[PDB]
Design an enzyme around this catalytic site. Structure first.
Site, PDB file in Angstrom:
ATOM      1  N   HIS A  43       0.899  -1.242  -0.067  1.00  0.00           N
ATOM      2  CA  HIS A  43      -0.153  -0.030   0.037  1.00  0.00           C
ATOM      3  C   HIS A  43       0.802   1.455  -0.110  1.00  0.00           C
ATOM      4  CE1 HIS A  43       0.839   0.260   4.206  1.00  0.00           C
ATOM      5  NE2 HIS A  43      -0.079   1.261   4.411  1.00  0.00           N
ATOM      6  N   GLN A 115      -7.570  -2.909   9.860  1.00  0.00           N
ATOM      7  CA  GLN A 115      -8.737  -1.973   9.818  1.00  0.00           C
ATOM      8  C   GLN A 115      -9.892  -2.259   8.840  1.00  0.00           C
ATOM      9  OE1 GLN A 115      -8.108   2.491  10.406  1.00  0.00           O
ATOM     10  NE2 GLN A 115      -5.904   1.892  10.200  1.00  0.00           N
TER      11      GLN A 115
HETATM   12  C1  LIG Z   1       0.903  -0.400  11.231  1.00  0.00           C
HETATM   13  C2  LIG Z   1       1.325  -0.177   9.645  1.00  0.00           C
HETATM   14  O1  LIG Z   1       2.454  -0.549   9.262  1.00  0.00           O
HETATM   15  N1  LIG Z   1       0.766   0.669   9.028  1.00  0.00           N
HETATM   16  C3  LIG Z   1      -0.487   1.568   9.493  1.00  0.00           C
HETATM   17  C4  LIG Z   1      -0.021   2.868   9.803  1.00  0.00           C
HETATM   18  O2  LIG Z   1      -0.931   3.494  10.277  1.00  0.00           O
HETATM   19  P1  LIG Z   1      -1.124   3.946  11.953  1.00  0.00           P
HETATM   20  O3  LIG Z   1       0.161   5.112  12.117  1.00  0.00           O
HETATM   21  O4  LIG Z   1      -0.844   2.865  12.660  1.00  0.00           O
HETATM   22  O5  LIG Z   1      -2.095   4.995  12.200  1.00  0.00           O
HETATM   23  C5  LIG Z   1      -1.445   1.166   8.350  1.00  0.00           C
HETATM   24  N2  LIG Z   1      -1.905  -0.143   8.551  1.00  0.00           N
HETATM   25  C6  LIG Z   1      -1.643  -0.481   7.056  1.00  0.00           C
HETATM   26  C7  LIG Z   1      -2.952  -1.157   6.556  1.00  0.00           C
HETATM   27  C8  LIG Z   1      -4.080  -0.763   7.539  1.00  0.00           C
HETATM   28  C9  LIG Z   1      -3.129  -0.109   8.688  1.00  0.00           C
HETATM   29  C10 LIG Z   1      -3.780  -1.189   9.536  1.00  0.00           C
HETATM   30  O6  LIG Z   1      -4.967  -1.748   9.828  1.00  0.00           O
HETATM   31  N3  LIG Z   1      -2.711  -1.720  10.390  1.00  0.00           N
HETATM   32  C11 LIG Z   1      -2.610  -2.462  11.598  1.00  0.00           C
HETATM   33  C12 LIG Z   1      -1.151  -3.275  11.617  1.00  0.00           C
HETATM   34  C13 LIG Z   1      -1.304  -4.677  11.478  1.00  0.00           C
HETATM   35  C14 LIG Z   1      -1.881  -5.637  12.060  1.00  0.00           C
HETATM   36  N4  LIG Z   1      -1.602  -6.934  11.714  1.00  0.00           N
HETATM   37  C15 LIG Z   1      -1.005  -6.927  10.536  1.00  0.00           C
HETATM   38  C16 LIG Z   1      -0.283  -7.865   9.835  1.00  0.00           C
HETATM   39  C17 LIG Z   1       0.575  -7.258   8.706  1.00  0.00           C
HETATM   40  C18 LIG Z   1       0.872  -6.200   8.519  1.00  0.00           C
HETATM   41  C19 LIG Z   1       0.469  -5.076   9.107  1.00  0.00           C
HETATM   42  C20 LIG Z   1      -0.606  -5.404  10.254  1.00  0.00           C
END
Ligand SMILES: CC(=O)N[C@@H](COP(=O)(O)O)CN1CCC[C@H]1C(=O)NCCc1c[nH]c2ccccc12
Length: 147
Positions: A43, A115
């Protein structure tokens, strides 16, 4: 027919039919073409003042408006679709996520991890497909399904 989320629409400029997906916000002229256990996506995230966490490796305080973020996202999508720039290159340079260092790669995930808007969009894409702007509490995403 038409895969999940896909809908037929009418071009306001051309009068030509096109296809739009209300889950992924993808749109295309061409007709689209079961849901798996896991998917792998990359992404590109553009944050805004209303992001749940208004900061990133790119800038300590993110101050652009949600409207300005959407314009940026739209611009990147245009660059990607025209072939002027590739997704991976834009993600590395411009994504407000640490996954930028991996060309936007998030690795594989299953439902119930991300999310919800991101998850739904990711699982509605087929391998190789890209979303339009997808809105979450984190910001605005362009999502590419790689597996
Ligand atoms: C955290 C990150 O690397 N990026 C986030 C940045 O946004 P913040 O600064 O946090 O608001 C944005 N995320 C990426 C796509 C949606 C969002 C999300 O839901 N993260 C949950 C992370 C997560 C949970 N299990 C996973 C399994 C694989 C990869 C990522 C995840």
């Amino acid at each position: 027919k038409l895969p999940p989320g896909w809908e037929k629409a009418m071009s306001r400029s051309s009068g030509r039919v096109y296809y739009f997906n209300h889950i992924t916000n993808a749109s295309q002229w061409e007709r689209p073409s079961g849901e798996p256990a896991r998917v792998r996506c990359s992404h590109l995230l553009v944050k805004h003042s209303q992001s749940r966490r208004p900061s990133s490796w790119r800038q300590e305080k993110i101050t652009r408006t949600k409207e300005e973020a959407l314009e940026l996202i739209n611009g990147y999508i245009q660059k990607i679709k025209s072939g002027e720039e590739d997704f991976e290159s834009l993600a590395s340079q411009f994504s407000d996520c640490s996954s930028a260092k991996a060309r936007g790669d998030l690795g594989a995930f299953s439902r119930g991890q991300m999310q919800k808007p991101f998850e739904d969009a990711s699982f509605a894409l087929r391998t190789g497909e890209m979303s339009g702007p997808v809105f979450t509490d984190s910001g605005i995403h362009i999502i590419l399904r790689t597996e």
